[PDB]
Design a protein around this ligand. Structure first.
Ligand SMILES: CN[C@@H]1[C@H](O)[C@H](NC)[C@H]2O[C@@]3(O)C(=O)C[C@@H](C)O[C@H]3O[C@@H]2[C@H]1O
Lengths: 240, 153, 5
RNA sequence: AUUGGGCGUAAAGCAAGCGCAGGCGGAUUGAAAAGUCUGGUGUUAAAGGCAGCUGCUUAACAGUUGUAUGCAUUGGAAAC
RNA sequence: GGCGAAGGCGAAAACUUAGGCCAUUACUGACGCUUAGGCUUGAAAGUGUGGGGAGCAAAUAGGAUUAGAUACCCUAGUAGUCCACACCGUAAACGAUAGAUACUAGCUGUCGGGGCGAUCCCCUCGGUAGUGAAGUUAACACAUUAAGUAUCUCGCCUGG
RNA sequence: GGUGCAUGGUUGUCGUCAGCUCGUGUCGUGAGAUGUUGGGUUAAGUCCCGCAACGAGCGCAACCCUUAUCGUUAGUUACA
């Protein structure tokens, strides 16, 4: 129904035989190609289910936060998607405690407001040390609390690139009652994710295509244009 | 909504140039109508520890179901090697329990139940085992939906 | 289920 | 600790092995039924436990109405 | 790394013998597990009979050391350490885990058997190790060779 | 007059050493750990990058004073 299979050409390429046998129903015989290869029909069905759920959630003002922490490609991806659609985002991964309670988020947003509206009148009046401290505090807030400045209630949804390397937030979400949608190839615990996406993120092109697809999925909620949902073209771009 | 104490203890960590004495408090919270929980806290004095324990227990609040004002099926709960054996009490006999178990059962809004303790009694471990056993409770609708028959028997 | 409200 | 516990570091798995007796055991069918399940019959005294009733001013009590495992014969059931 | 039930087993060869693994397309007909009592084996030190006794060396002597040193250090010197015969039956004789029976996610090395084949890798049955989810144990930790799952038998356990 | 092992106040020492604990949340049935951890940079949890941690207080630095440059005030009993 969406994203015809002719555009998915390099959807595999995960690590060699280092996985979790909690999966397997989504995987074809492993020892036949020495790589984690997925079945594409169930892939498209899961993608359609994820699209349906995210559009249902966002239709009623469901705000989402991206999870982008890997080295180079996902950084630019999350930057582009966050600057395109008015949603919160995470630059560097959580240190714990920034998602389990709102009071810390409240003092963080208060610090951000005070800092910006005070540094608006303090840039060269005193020594370079205090101005540099103000700039460093701004940059630190961008590093950790950069995207969390437009929310008054706890985030109702979040999209994760992989449960590994982001275990803290997903564990809190298991503790919490918030639904979870995430990417996972085979190195996950499927119990911790409620909307499984068996889409491999090893190849950058597939990650870019899926991220743009989800951005367009959340785009229709706020009445903003869509770019790559039914387009008969696959995103091809040499790794930077 | 009752917040009765269970067991308050003196604890202390030993450090170079003095050891820090403090109070540890165990609390259990129950509306007597279904919302129950338990918590631990430690602090330098009474009020901070009490507030910490109340907040912790309120955060971990969870509901519990009532079967004709009784626990309609047997349960042997275990946690930290402390067996708790709970069995239904026919209405018109009264509720029997020991102090900590007394408070736990009365705080959960349970009319009567026959209880027994196996193993070395220990307050926190016993509370954990009892709550694990009570939250393990089944229901006739559960067995009905997991079975083919839609009746109790 | 869907439609998280 | 049959109900109702253990044997790695707290007591406790023998230094290891061959094995008598004992205990426990692959599937299908038959026969009886050695126990078991299930009836009838006779036997488990009286007093006493337990339930109802009655006269002791009344409870204490006493009496009465029944109940109580087990055993043997006898006929069914043949899943173990 | 391998072997055997354990203790234990490493120069070369000659003789006899033990059990193990794989395909069974072969045979007999459940003949299987465990095992009270008994029986066999069972490091090293020692006891008895007799040899041989190069070194090594408890006790023993001397010299240093120490307040003292009947010890660590050094030089001396028997029992013994070797073997033939008949004894002892002790242990940290430890995986401190009795055996057997099946069953319960994976991953990485090593070796043995079978096939394919320059080696190498491949698959299948196994010995043997390490890593690691469920689960278990109070914890440590254990993890298809379980301290998991349940069963059968024997032995052992009741404060110091 | 005595009891600084009965005391307030003040003082020495580690020592101008940089560590001490706190709130929140997580982990573990627990004492507890997590920050304060690892890597660079200084004498310094001064500072930052990463990390199941985020902040916050204390001491440390900055918050006082002088010396050396200059502006600017008054020129005396300096100055002449
Ligand atoms: C040798 N310097 C030490 C060192 O700085 C100690 N911290 C690691 C420090 O610890 C203290 O600050 C304390 O917290 C308690 C006291 C006993 O010693 C104090 O003085 C202690 C200093 O004397």
């Amino acid at each position: 129904s969406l994203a015809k299979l002719g555009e998915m050409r390099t959807h595999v390429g995960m690590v060699k035989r280092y996985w979790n046998p909690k999966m397997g129903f989504f995987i074809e015989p492993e020892r036949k190609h020495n790589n984690d290869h997925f079945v594409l029909e169930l892939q498209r069905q899961s993608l359609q289910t994820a699209y349906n759920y995210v559009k249902e959630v966002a239709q009623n003002n469901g705000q989402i936060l991206f999870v982008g922490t890997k080295n180079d490609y996902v950084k630019k991806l999350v930057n582009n998607i966050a600057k395109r659609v008015d949603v919160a985002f995470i630059t560097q991964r959580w240190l714990g405690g920034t998602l389990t309670n709102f009071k810390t988020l409240s003092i963080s947003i208060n610090k951000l407001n005070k800092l910006v509206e005070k540094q608006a009148e303090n840039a060269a009046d005193l020594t370079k040390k205090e101005n540099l401290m103000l700039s460093r505090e701004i940059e630190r807030l961008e590093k950790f609390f950069g995207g969390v400045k437009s929310l008054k209630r706890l985030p109702n949804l979040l999209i994760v690139d992989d449960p590994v390397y982001e275990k803290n937030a997903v564990a809190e979400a298991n503790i919490l009652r918030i639904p979870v949608v995430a990417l996972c190839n085979t190195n996950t615990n499927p119990e911790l994710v409620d909307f499984i996406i068996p889409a491999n993120n090893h190849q950058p092109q597939s990650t870019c295509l899926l991220m743009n697809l989800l951005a367009d999925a959340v785009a229709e909620a706020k009445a903003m244009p869509t770019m790559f949902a039914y387009k008969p073209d696959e995103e091809i771009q040499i790794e930077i | 909504f009752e917040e009765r104490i269970v067991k308050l203890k003196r604890i202390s960590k030993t450090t170079k140039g003095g050891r820090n004495m403090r109070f540890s408090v165990l609390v259990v919270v129950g509306n007597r109508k279904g919302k129950i929980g338990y918590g631990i806290a430690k602090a330098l004095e009474v009020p901070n520890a009490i507030k910490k324990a109340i907040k912790a227990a309120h955060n971990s609040l969870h509901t519990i179901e009532i079967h004709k004002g009784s626990i309609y099926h047997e349960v042997i709960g275990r946690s930290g090697a402390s067996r708790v054996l709970l069995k239904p009490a026919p209405q018109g006999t009264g509720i029997i329990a020991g102090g900590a178990i007394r408070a736990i059962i009365e705080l959960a809004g349970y009319s009567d139940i026959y209880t027994k303790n196996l193993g070395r009694n220990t307050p926190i471990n016993m509370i954990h085992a009892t709550m694990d056993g009570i939250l393990k409770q089944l229901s006739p609708r559960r067995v009905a939906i997991l079975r083919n028959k839609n009746l109790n028997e | 289920m869907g439609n998280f409200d």
